[PDB]
Amino acid sequence: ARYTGPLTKKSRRLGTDLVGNDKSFERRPYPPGVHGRGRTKDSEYSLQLREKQKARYAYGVLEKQFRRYYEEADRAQGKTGDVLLQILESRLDNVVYRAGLAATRRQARQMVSHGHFLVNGKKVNIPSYRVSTHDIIDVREKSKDLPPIVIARETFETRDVPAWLEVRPNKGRILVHQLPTRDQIVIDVNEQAIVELYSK
């Protein structure tokens, strides 16, 4: 119920950097496997499916839960892709990643599932915990000196925190100013393509 295999293979297949940089993605222009350099047809399904899989492997969400997110966004009022990206960003592991306390979303999932975090006073070990507005995520007092935590404390200045979060790095406290908007989620997929895909 969690993808544990290599991520560079998925990034190469999907054609975009799922996470990180300056890595084995120097072989980017071609998917993994023996048949990587051949010319591709890329149907509309192919395109749509690529966008959906890009979002899925970026956020570490499997198909059933991603589908559930899709119906929630579709029911919600407003743009379906905007709401879907808003939900995926409101996931707690992504919140930790965006605040910059984790090197990657996989590391954020690791620490969240291991329970190194407090949500507004209550301990949460659910990576899919949907953080609500005005929430206060806190690092567990016992685990305020994790090696990944201190690496993040050394590196966060380079990292860019989105406008909808406030982070007290050394304190391990992520204040949620508001639930993010499409202009605030970084554009790296085609949510419109995903929405069109979930209609066929």
């Binding site: 507004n120 005005h134 929430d135 206060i136 305020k144 000196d145 201190v150 404390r153 406030e166 007290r168 790095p169 050394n170 304190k171 391990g172 406290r173 204040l175």
Partner: protein, 128 residues
């Protein structure tokens, strides 16, 4: 006989009762003549909401309460208004009150010791 009793609802190991009016012969979780209130005992200082006018009407028309409903009416004070007896009538204590916006504004500004205990944990990694 017409009874004022509790109709069980909710999950396994999580009961919420509806103080309802139905005759004795009816099954426990069935059609009720009228729904009077609710009773959540699983919650802190159990929630006890009883419609005073309706419960007074049904007591005056002759509905027989079950012992549980008698306890709830004692706590709501209805069991004293009807069948006047010297009982404490301990109207439910509230199950306290949290808040979110005030805490967020308190911490947004908290700043100071936020990043301050934060550089103290910097000294901690030093200690780490």
């Amino acid at each position: 006989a017409t009874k004022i009793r509790l109709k069980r609802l909710g999950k396994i190991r999580t009961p919420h009762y509806r103080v309802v009016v139905m005759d004795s012969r009816a099954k426990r979780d069935g059609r009720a003549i009228e729904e009077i209130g609710q009773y959540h005992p699983k919650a802190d200082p159990s929630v006890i909401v009883i419609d005073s006018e309706r419960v007074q009407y049904w007591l005056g028309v002759g509905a027989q309460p079950t012992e549980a409903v008698v306890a709830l009416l004692k706590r709501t004070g209805d069991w004293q208004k009807f069948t006047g007896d010297t009982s404490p009538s301990g109207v439910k204590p509230q199950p306290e009150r949290p808040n979110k916006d005030d805490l967020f504004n308190a911490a947004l500004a908290e700043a100071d010791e936020a990043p301050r205990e934060a550089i103290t944990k910097k000294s901690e990694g030093a200690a780490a």
